[PDB]
Write a protein that binds this DNA or RNA. Structure first.
Ligand SMILES: [Mg+2]
Ligand SMILES: [Mg+2]
Ligand SMILES: [Mg+2]
Ligand SMILES: [Mg+2]
Ligand SMILES: [Mg+2]
Ligand SMILES: [Mg+2]
Ligand SMILES: [Mg+2]
Ligand SMILES: [Mg+2]
Ligand SMILES: [Mg+2]
Ligand SMILES: [Mg+2]
Ligand SMILES: [Mg+2]
Ligand SMILES: [Mg+2]
Ligand SMILES: [Mg+2]
Ligand SMILES: [Mg+2]
Ligand SMILES: [Mg+2]
Ligand SMILES: [Mg+2]
Ligand SMILES: [Mg+2]
Ligand SMILES: [Mg+2]
Ligand SMILES: [Mg+2]
Ligand SMILES: [Mg+2]
Ligand SMILES: [Mg+2]
Ligand SMILES: [Mg+2]
Ligand SMILES: [Mg+2]
Ligand SMILES: [Mg+2]
Ligand SMILES: [Mg+2]
Ligand SMILES: [Mg+2]
Ligand SMILES: [Mg+2]
Ligand SMILES: [Mg+2]
Length: 206
RNA sequence: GCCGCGGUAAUACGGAGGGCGCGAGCGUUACCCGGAUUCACUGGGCGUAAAGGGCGUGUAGGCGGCCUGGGGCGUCCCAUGUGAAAGACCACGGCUCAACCGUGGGGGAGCGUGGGAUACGCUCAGGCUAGACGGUGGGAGAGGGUGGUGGAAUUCCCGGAGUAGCGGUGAAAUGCGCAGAUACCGGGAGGAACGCCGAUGGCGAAGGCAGCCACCUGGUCCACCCGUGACGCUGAGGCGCGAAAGCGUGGGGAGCAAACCGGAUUAGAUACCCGGGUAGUCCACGCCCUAAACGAUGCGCGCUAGGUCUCUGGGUCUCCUGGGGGCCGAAGCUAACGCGUUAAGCGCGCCGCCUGGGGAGUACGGCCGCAAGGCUGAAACUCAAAGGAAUUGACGGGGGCCCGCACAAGCGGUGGAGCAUGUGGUUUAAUUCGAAGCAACGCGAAGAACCUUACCAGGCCUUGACAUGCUAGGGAACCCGGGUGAAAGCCUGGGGUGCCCCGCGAGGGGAGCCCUAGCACAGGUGCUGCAUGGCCGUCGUCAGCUCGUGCCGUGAGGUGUUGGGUUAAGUCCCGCAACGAGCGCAACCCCCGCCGUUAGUUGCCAGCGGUUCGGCCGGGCACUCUAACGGGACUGCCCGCGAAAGCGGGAGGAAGGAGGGGACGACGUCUGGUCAGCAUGGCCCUUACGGCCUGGGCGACACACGUGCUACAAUGCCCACUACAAAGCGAUGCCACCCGGCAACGGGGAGCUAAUCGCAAAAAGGUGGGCCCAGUUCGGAUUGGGGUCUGCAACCCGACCCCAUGAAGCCGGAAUCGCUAGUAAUCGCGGAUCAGCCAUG
């Protein structure tokens, strides 16, 4: 057990807060809680799309919600009827009355959370783990970026023994509180147990 | 069949499905050949894996230089006879094919006879000298045997001199000394070995061999080319030689020393250590014959780079030529290590020997011995190995280097006591569960009176305290009373249905919902963290772990990452078949150090006038502070050591060589922790391992330990007065101020959503004074009694106030802990959880 979360270790600099807004004292908790709820819905729904991150800004009964996807068309929908149900379904949950934006992902092949879920899926589809991995890695590696690295839990293949798979190219400096490394964790339910998927992606500098 | 497969995911057991193979057959068992170059003629081996005979002498035998000529045995060639048939090969043919059978055809090694060749081998004769042996002359030598002399030292005896201890050991003791030892001087007897030279050397067939001297004797090397003329190399059997030990007869016996006698160490010592002591070690003759008898490498001969050191002879002599010993190395060899003209290379001759480990060098037979034993030397059985060299790593009571409060130096403490808190044991109806060496034990639990709580008893509910959905039925939302009850819950009573569609309307249908019943199912802190994610601990904040390309190597891998130096560091320098790069190290980030800019409802007579002199008001942002940005140390500067890095010192400076401290914890280790945070695979429970409730339990003890607090006192303790802080906290809260009460605190009550109100006095400190060394104005436990507050409730189990009681305790056994600075020690204040609170954490 080691290696702090590269994100939170960088929250001060090269990386920000998924929920930026103020309050406190007697609202925070209630308000904060409110966030887990949305993120709750957006995640169980906009999956097949590529939920990458969920920014949530606030200014008193006026939330933001800016879902990050790779295939925004799925979030949107036919002509945009589904961004009507979600946007509306979100209210039946929070009467705060908020909007909902959707920013496409510039080559999801560079979004940790995605580079992982990608892998995740493959695993659940019973795909050689060692490959999906080496595969994903090269992808990132091959789509710009100066460094990538994917890690997969144990039971790789339903092995009776809890193993670990590696693979990783370029530079990936988790200690350099400046590097600006994207992180992401994909869980992998499976007939033989649960497998965790970690993906780091290193982009430029500042 | 070999390797193995099965201990709760088995492609290796059993069945199913499927699939491959082969098909009137397919498997099996046994035996022969093959694979097996694993008896090797074709086609192997012996330095370390199994394998060189301990050495020599030499018999049978095998092998044999150069030239010419006879034979022409081998050998080769031609002819021919034989080589029946069947089978085999081939062509053709018959039974519808084939199998099977018929016809014809081919070849055959060997052997007989005839003829031919004559290179090579055999034989014969003749001749030579390049092998070998002899001769001439020279050299070195611990080669051997015989006799004899020499000095040192040791022990024993005699004399002198001289004491009280000597000797011995990790310490000791036995032992020896006042019948005087040891230690010193002199003299005498005896045995054994033989210093320095001496060596990395010599000689010998091996074993083995060193004081010197003489004598008898072996071998050997060189120079000369003088003599013989192939006379040669090997060598089964035989014979002889053969360390030490042991054996026989006899002598000798100084020292040493099996056995044995005591001493000591040890849990026990028939052992390592110590003091004695026999065989023995010694010599003679006789016997034994083994050995890591090792170069672990048979003998001889020819051939294939060098260099370097060394012994010995010749030499036109620090150069070349011969013999011997070592080192390093060409080609080559080798599994590698390594070997390499002192080959483990290239070749030829001959000899010995191996053919998996264990059983066995054992059993039996035989030969040999005085005996101990020796040489020759199996199998049954059994196991899949035994094994060799080298690579990585780990480990060592191995070594060099080197870090960390790791040790030491030092300060305070723990182990003693009272208490607090955790843990074990005891125990209990239950005292829920986990954590266990460091890396469990005030740890999860930043808060157990109920709740929490998962345990225990008792009462009680079952689609349930929770999620989506189905079938039949009544009524449906929901709100308010009553009875039994500890509560839960069970039983039960009355207000009250609208919502959409169709219908004059009664009324019917139908959506969200409630309830009985059946169902899918909830739920489970119920096992498994050796099925897992997740997160954490830990070696380690240690300085390391790797990758690419190239190079080395059959290969595993090595090289770079080692080496010298430097560093907090695989940090940096220089070197180097490596050149780089990644993860880590560093830097980036935060807080504290000086400074500036920005901003002043913080702050100040600092500058000014008014004052209820409390900066209160005017006013001003200077200073303080506030919080943002930014500057600033880089060994940059000077001296000096160094190749360089880097190191010592100095200067300016708030700050110096990473300015202090954070945050940050590599590839990996441990089947490390957690299925009780959460997640999830499998197993298990579903009138119950589900759920509610009250009460109890998680809080007991006569015990032990851990982590703590408070002390045992006057470098103190009590009272009065009075001074300086930081960091946090506060609406369903912090509470100034007054009165009340000794007080806890109650009642009234202002300000504050808070740099500019409150929690707050900070305490140690300072000032006056008291106590006066005593269990004492030290210590506060325990207990009695009263009382306040929180909370529905404080018996089991709260905190607090007041009086009374005032205990253990006079500084802690073995052992053990933290800390290198603003740290340790010491003194308070704050917060999280939290009604309150056992926080001395
Ligand atoms: Mg054969
Ligand atoms: Mg062989
Ligand atoms: Mg001849
Ligand atoms: Mg003939
Ligand atoms: Mg015939
Ligand atoms: Mg002749
Ligand atoms: Mg002689
Ligand atoms: Mg001979
Ligand atoms: Mg003898
Ligand atoms: Mg004798
Ligand atoms: Mg004697
Ligand atoms: Mg051998
Ligand atoms: Mg000469
Ligand atoms: Mg020589
Ligand atoms: Mg060599
Ligand atoms: Mg070579
Ligand atoms: Mg023997
Ligand atoms: Mg016998
Ligand atoms: Mg051996
Ligand atoms: Mg070995
Ligand atoms: Mg230190
Ligand atoms: Mg010490
Ligand atoms: Mg104690
Ligand atoms: Mg330095
Ligand atoms: Mg370091
Ligand atoms: Mg760092
Ligand atoms: Mg375990
Ligand atoms: Mg407890």
């Amino acid at each position: 057990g080691n290696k702090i979360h590269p994100i939170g270790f960088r929250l001060g600099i090269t990386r920000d807060w998924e929920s930026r807004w103020y309050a406190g004292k007697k609202q925070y908790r209630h308000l904060l809680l409110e966030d887990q709820r949305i993120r709750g819905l957006l995640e169980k729904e906009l999956y097949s799309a590529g939920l990458a991150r969920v920014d949530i800004e606030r200014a008193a009964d006026n939330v933001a919600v800016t879902v990050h996807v790779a295939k925004p068309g799925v979030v949107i929908g036919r002509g945009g009827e589904r961004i009507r149900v979600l946007r509306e379904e979100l209210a039946k949950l929070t009467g705060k009355n908020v909007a909902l934006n959707v920013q496409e992902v510039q080559n999801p092949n560079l979004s940790a959370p995605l580079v992982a879920q990608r892998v995740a899926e493959q695993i659940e589809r019973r795909f050689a783990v060692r490959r999906a991995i080496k595969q994903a890695v090269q992808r990132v590696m091959e789509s710009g970026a100066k460094g990538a690295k994917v890690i997969v839990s144990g039971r790789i293949g339903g092995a009776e023994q809890a193993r670990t798979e590696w693979a990783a190219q370029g530079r990936v400096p988790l200690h350099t509180l400046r590097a600006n490394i994207d992180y992401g964790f994909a869980l992998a339910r499976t007939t033989y147990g649960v497998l965790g998927v970690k993906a780091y992606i290193f982009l430029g500098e500042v």
